Amino acid sequence: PITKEEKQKVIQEFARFPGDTGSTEVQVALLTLRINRLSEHLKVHKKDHHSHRGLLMMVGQRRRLLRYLQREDPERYRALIEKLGIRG
Amino acid sequence: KRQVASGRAYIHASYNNTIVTITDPDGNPITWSSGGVIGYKGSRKGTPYAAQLAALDAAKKAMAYGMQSVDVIVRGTGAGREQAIRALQASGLQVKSIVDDTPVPHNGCRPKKKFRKAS
Amino acid sequence: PSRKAKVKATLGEFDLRDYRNVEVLKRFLSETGKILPRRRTGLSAKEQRILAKTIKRARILGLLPFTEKLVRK
């Protein structure tokens, strides 16, 4: 599904400073990944609801984090969005 | 008029009737009996008595084909399954073995209401 | 009843994921085809649970019987 490698790419990509595991950036990138993987799963298997719950919870966590970013740093936020192709 | 002499005896048991079929070693029936074979009509066919009788008859008719050795299959849980066994045991026929074959599903079909509270 | 023989004391170390091993798995089926209870295997919760699956794989391949006729009775 998501390899220790795919993950490594995305973290070493989004980390503030090397070795940054859990910064707001990174978390939001892992999330986005998991979410797109999952919504892709759910364009087929539109009958699999219990997973879709996972999805809503996931988007909840994402938005939470972002509105926190917007709060603390409107820059890191705007940048990470455009880079991640969100806002929708 | 085969002259078999070595064969199979099938006892089938209900809370309704008991019925004994006897075959050759290949499963092909030679002679048989049941509770209604003897004069019993109503419920009486499920009696251990009725069973003993059907057993005995089936075996006697089977001596007429000259049978001696028989291996015994039993299906169904019934009154008089065991009296039919015991009957055959000395009918003068020699019972070489007995087996319980009573068929049980892995939950195939919703039984009638009569049999439910289980599947 | 069932305090007489526990199938765990029967052999020592044996692979419980091994569905190809007839004579060992076959140690867990009753006189009929039935997979024995935790009682008479004396397995652990999980051991038992694993036995279940490996025995069903064995069944499906044709190694272990699904149901067997009862002798005597």
Add this chain to the structure above:
Amino acid sequence: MRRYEVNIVLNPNLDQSQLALEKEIIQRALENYGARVEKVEELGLRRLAYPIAKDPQGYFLWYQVEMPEDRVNDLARELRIRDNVRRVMVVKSQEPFLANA
């Protein structure tokens, strides 16, 4: 790329040519669904607990392979296409788990 185990039980009745033909079609199969063969056991004729295809015995092989997951099912589908093949069972390889140790 994961490790699986491919169980195949085919006709007790095959002679040398027919069987080494089946095995050949199996090789071709695995290969063309993308499986590398790590070890193999041909246990051959063995005695079935219940009759399969009216034959009381079966010819057993087992192959431990590495293949791409995404095609695994189709592979089995192919292995099963063959007439002479009466069982196919693919397992994801699991590490041995032993009681009494």
Add this chain to the structure above:
RNA sequence: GUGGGAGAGGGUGGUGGAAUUCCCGGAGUAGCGGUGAAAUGCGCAGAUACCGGGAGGAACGCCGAUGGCGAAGGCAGCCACCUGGUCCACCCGUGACGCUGAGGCGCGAAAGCGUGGGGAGCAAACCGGAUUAGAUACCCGGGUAGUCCACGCCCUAAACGAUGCGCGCUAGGUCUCUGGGUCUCCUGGGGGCCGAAGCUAACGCGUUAAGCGCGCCGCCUGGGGAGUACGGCCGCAAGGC
């Protein structure tokens, strides 16, 4: 984050044997079935019982539990793919990013609806046989929807722990599932049981609180009229809010 663990959590595809019914063939003959007792029913066009072959539907025995998973409804043969939640150790990274949550959106047993499909077993209605004072029933023989599949509606319930969510504080003993460690023991997550304090009208609850506390939502205000009337909203309808 990293590294490990358990699971009927979900979607799709494949697939195994048991059983029933049906068909084909063999052997076989006077009844089978069913009940309190019986009749209707099935059988001489050969039934039941028995052996061999085939077709199809539905459901997965043992394991299985005092068990596990899930927000809930709910989830059980086996295989693979896809996928959600969860837990433990490391104490690595973020730095209050938290809690609840009117409305909204999503799900939501069963029954029920629309289009097809499938239809073995069961079975409302229905057709019979019995029973009874009658018997629009309990019993018996049949049978249609349905139950099954896809897609779309329906939104209900003793939808129950009749117990909203989160966090903190308050003796213990024992059983169990499942992780971890220096593995007589210790330590973390879950399911039971008995009990300190305490609470409760009582029953009883008691670290899985119904105790002691804070936050936030929902809800109650004597019984019947009544989940009715009216209006609105939803629905193909049945109907729901």
